[PDB]
Structure 1
Amino acid sequence: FNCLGMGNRDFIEGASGATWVDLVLEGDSCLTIMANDKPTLDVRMINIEASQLAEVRSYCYHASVTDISTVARCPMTGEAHNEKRADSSYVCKQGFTDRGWGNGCGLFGKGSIDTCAKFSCTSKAIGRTIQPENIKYEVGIFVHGTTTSENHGNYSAQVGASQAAKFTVTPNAPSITLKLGDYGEVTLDCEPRSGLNTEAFYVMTVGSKSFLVHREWFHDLALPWTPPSSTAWRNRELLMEFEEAHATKQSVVALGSQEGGLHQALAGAIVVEYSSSVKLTSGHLKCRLKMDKLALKGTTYGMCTGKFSFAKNPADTGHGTVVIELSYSGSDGPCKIPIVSVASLNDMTPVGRLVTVNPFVATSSANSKVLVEMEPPFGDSYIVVGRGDKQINHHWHKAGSTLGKAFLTTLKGAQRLAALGDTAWDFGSIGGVFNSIGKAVHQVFGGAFRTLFGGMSWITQGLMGALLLWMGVNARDRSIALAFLATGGVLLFLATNVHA
């Protein structure tokens, strides 16, 4: 629900100018909003939920042969007919048995037989189709107040402080307004139906576990399949075989369990669990964060007059910021916690910015732990907690200097452009003009081009790109980039994006 210790933690730089913002989020990633008058926010997906799922069809991967029956007939008799062709449970096939005068017939060289075997399915997979309204999204939202190592990673604890909230956005109710209490209210307007594509794929159950598969590939699977209701199947002859015909003897043999082949047929499928509602891991949702009622109270709180302490030692979040936890032994609380991030000790001018804005002591109780995060600048810096003699400081250094960070925005920005489709420009939030046409140019470019030849797998589009790079070598003036258009970017990039 919060951004604490998440695998992917990305931030948001507030330019103010508007109280509303359109952001896209994910299950693994946690967005962090920092703005003026608005405290630090956490926005992430818990999982993707779906309420009602219809049964599209099923697939029998594992079968067994039962009741082999072959009716032998003489040559020149034409078709052979076994009485088992009436029931659909019996799998019947034409054929022949080369006849002499020794076996069953008075003629030579030819024959006719009808080989029927009752079909028995040992194991079958089942698919499921997703309805748009049934899709639910549990979106953890959190605002950073006074926190500890316990309550901050705790939900119900911050609900008592009204600093964390959960909710379910559906196409029936895409808009939800939740109050943060002392910090005001925020309005979240999402797009549940358009976050994913509900009809783009199915949910296939292989064995006990269920998995995601494209629905156009779902019907293109070659394997005996099943209608929703009960009985009559199609292509059930594929799991069984035939042999030579010696007199009346022909053995219909069944293929083994194809479950492994189904697991082999699954490559990019996402593992999905379930209990009473399916929980999808990687989220895609378009929400609107309205901060209008969210504000800062409590500027009435001056600095704290007493000693600090470290409840836990400082470390690096790996996302570019440094978090600390402080146990304040002074009894003068509630008070605004003095703290900064400075270049040198002789220079009291704050440089680094606090990730958690306005650190505050909850209650007058001494030794109360408080967890506050800050973003120091690049190079050698210092974490200074308190003013005067009361201060206890720490040295920090961060090698991520904007040279490499410019590429971390650039390179990941193109990675943000990839795999997000046309929604990639939603990071262009509070947009228009550029950001609007930047998505619009890529809109039809996303509705054509890459999607037209899309479906290429790994080196398929990657290898030919190197051959399409040769198209840029042979060309004419003003015709150079014409053969080079789709080559560089959008093609080799995603090939370099996923290596492996």
Structure 2
Amino acid sequence: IRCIGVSNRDFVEGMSGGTWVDVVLEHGGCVTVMAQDKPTVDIELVTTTVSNMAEVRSYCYEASISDMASDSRCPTQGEAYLDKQSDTQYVCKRTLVDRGWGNGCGLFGKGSLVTCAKFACSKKMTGKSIQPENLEYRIMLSVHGSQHSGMIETDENRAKVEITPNSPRAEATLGGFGSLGLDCEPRTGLDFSDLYYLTMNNKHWLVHKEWFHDIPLPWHAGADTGTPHWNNKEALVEFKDAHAKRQTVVVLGSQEGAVHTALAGALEAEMDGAKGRLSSGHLKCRLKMDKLRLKGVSYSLCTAAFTFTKIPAETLHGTVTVEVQYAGTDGPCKVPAQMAVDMQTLTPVGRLITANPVITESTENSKMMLELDPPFGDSYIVIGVGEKKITHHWHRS
């Protein structure tokens, strides 16, 4: 069904009091929950989202310069002046340079030189804050066992639920099975509110705050962003050795690759509609199952012949999947399905993960998939009852 193919799959069995089951979810996997006299339920954390992320600071990693100008004074002739000195968008540099008869001065002393160049940001990165109240977790719950395969359905057998730090509880409504209660809480170890959400050229990371604050790049505070004011423009703007009347101004190359190098190992994230999308958390949920019911408890056993349509396969966790075909028309009915070691008494052994298997189709030759938890050492998969039962040898869990 859902959980069978996933590698990071956990199994939780409920206890005799059929009320509470504790579970922990993560983005890589899913959990299969089995309770006595209850339908088996697969629970998966689907997405983790952050909303309303506020700009903290923006760093410019590629910039350019324009309108380069210089002013010079002969010695004893005062301070060099440019109108661009007071402009906040201009990087400027003032020095003293050797002057003389070669460069047009009466004396040979030091003359003042100033050089300014306009700063423009071509490409920048943006960091955003994460507030605890703005996290949301989406969880999918499914009933283990259905007539047709495939993971694309939304009906009485499946439910999608949404939880929030300020709304930690929710109810997933199945069909005749009833309802399931969810009380969820983040697991300790990864607090997203202690990280910054970093975006650079349609790529997204989760970074530490003190590393983000110490980045040696031009930056602005992420407020009043109509036209920005850039602090530390000198991190990308350099002035070469000065000669009389002029200084050369150069821009450093794009620093996107350097930031990429420094970002190795950082948690990666995504954007979905101005919502941050994370894949690294853990979520502890308590299941309230007192309202969960099986459906076909009082069905009569299927009496026609079952046939294996597929060779049974062993999953990564030692369970067995079996696809069968029922030629019967008398339905709905309960399919006899078990693991047996003593072939005469047919005493059930192992575990039946797909709880209360049933054929819901009234037509002939309906196909259905089963999951079983076999015991260690040789056993037999037994499907059906009577002289029409089918048997298949199996080895271990």
Distance in structure 2 (CA, Å) of the matches to 1:108 and 1:147: 98
TM-score in terms of structure 1 length: 0.73
Partner amino acid, structure 2, of 1:47: T
Partner amino acid, structure 2, of 1:257: S
Matches for 1:367-446 after TM superposition, within 5 Å: 367-398=365-396
Partner amino acid, structure 1, of 2:176: D
Q: CA deviation at 1:390?
A: 1.2
Distance in structure 1 (CA, Å) of the matches to 2:77 and 2:262: 44
Bigger relative contact order, structure 1 or 2, given CA contacts below 8 A and separation 6+?
2
Q: Tell me: CA distance 1:169–1:85, structure 2 relative to 1, closer, same or farther (3 Å).
A: same
Q: Tell me: CA distance 1:337–1:75, structure 2 relative to 1, closer, same or farther (3 Å).
A: farther
Instruction: Give 1:201's aligned residue.
Output: 195
Distance in structure 2 (CA, Å) of the matches to 1:30 and 1:195: 20
Q: Deviations over 1:26-49 (max 9, x none)?
A: 111101111212221111111112
**C-alpha contact 2:309 2:324 (8 A) present in aligned 1:** yes
Q: CA deviation at 1:108?
A: 4.3
Distance in structure 2 (CA, Å) of the matches to 1:375 and 1:109: 94
**C-alpha contact 1:335 1:360 (8 A) present in aligned 2:** yes
| Secondary structure, aligned partner of 1:23 | strand
**C-alpha contact 1:323 1:374 (8 A) present in aligned 2:** yes
Q: CA deviation at 1:125?
A: 1.2
Distance in structure 2 (CA, Å) of the matches to 1:282 and 1:2: 21
Determine if the alignment matches structure 1 residue 57 to structure 2 residue 79. Answer: no
Distance in structure 2 (CA, Å) of the matches to 1:391 and 1:96: 101
Q: Tell me: CA distance 1:77–1:191, structure 2 relative to 1, closer, same or farther (3 Å).
A: farther
| Secondary structure, aligned partner of 2:257 | helix
**C-alpha contact 2:12 2:23 (8 A) present in aligned 1:** no
Instruction: Give 2:348's aligned residue.
Output: 350
**C-alpha contact 1:201 1:216 (8 A) present in aligned 2:** no
Segments of 5+ residues of structure 2 without an aligned counterpart are none
Q: Tell me: CA distance 1:316–1:105, structure 2 relative to 1, closer, same or farther (3 Å).
A: farther
Distance in structure 2 (CA, Å) of the matches to 1:138 and 1:232: 40
Instruction: Give 1:37's aligned residue.
Output: 37
Q: CA deviation at 1:111?
A: 4.1
| Secondary structure, aligned partner of 1:302 | coil
Q: Deviations over 1:147-186 (max 9, x none)?
A: 4213xx2232xx1xx1210021123422111222222211
Distance in structure 2 (CA, Å) of the matches to 1:325 and 1:133: 46
| Secondary structure, aligned partner of 1:88 | coil
| Secondary structure, aligned partner of 2:260 | helix
| Secondary structure, aligned partner of 2:211 | helix
| Worse overlay, 51-60 or 12-21 | 12-21
Determine if the alignment matches structure 1 residue 165 to structure 2 residue 159. Answer: yes
Partner amino acid, structure 2, of 1:351: V
Q: Deviations over 1:184-236 (max 9, x none)?
A: 21110123698962421121111022222223322222211122222112112
Partner amino acid, structure 2, of 1:36: Q
Distance in structure 1 (CA, Å) of the matches to 2:92 and 2:237: 11
Q: Tell me: CA distance 1:390–1:252, structure 2 relative to 1, closer, same or farther (3 Å).
A: same
Matches for 1:147-296 after TM superposition, within 5 Å: 147-150=147-150, 153-156=151-154, 159=155, 162-191=156-185, 197-228=191-222, 229-230=224-225, 231-276=228-273, 277-296=275-294
| Secondary structure, aligned partner of 1:389 | helix
Instruction: Give 1:301's aligned residue.
Output: 299
Distance in structure 1 (CA, Å) of the matches to 2:232 and 2:164: 39
Name the structure with the higher strand share. 2
Q: Deviations over 1:112-146 (max 9, x none)?
A: 32221110111111222223232221111112233
Segments of 5+ residues of structure 1 without an aligned counterpart are 401-500
Instruction: Give 1:457's aligned residue.
Output: none
Distance in structure 1 (CA, Å) of the matches to 2:219 and 2:18: 54
Larger Rg: 2
Instruction: Give 1:14's aligned residue.
Output: 14
Determine if the alignment matches structure 1 residue 97 to structure 2 residue 97. Answer: yes
Q: CA deviation at 1:109?
A: 6.6
TM-score in terms of structure 2 length: 0.90
Cα RMSD over matched residues? 2.5
Name the structure with the higher helix share. 1
Q: Tell me: CA distance 1:85–1:390, structure 2 relative to 1, closer, same or farther (3 Å).
A: same
Q: Deviations over 1:302-352 (max 9, x none)?
A: 321111123443212212211122221111221111111123646622222
Q: CA deviation at 1:355?
A: 1.1
Q: Tell me: CA distance 1:344–1:77, structure 2 relative to 1, closer, same or farther (3 Å).
A: farther
Partner amino acid, structure 2, of 1:223: L
**C-alpha contact 1:47 1:282 (8 A) present in aligned 2:** no
Q: Deviations over 1:215-271 (max 9, x none)?
A: 332222221112222211211210121211122232111111111122212122333
**C-alpha contact 1:45 1:283 (8 A) present in aligned 2:** no
**C-alpha contact 2:18 2:36 (8 A) present in aligned 1:** no
Matched residue count: 393
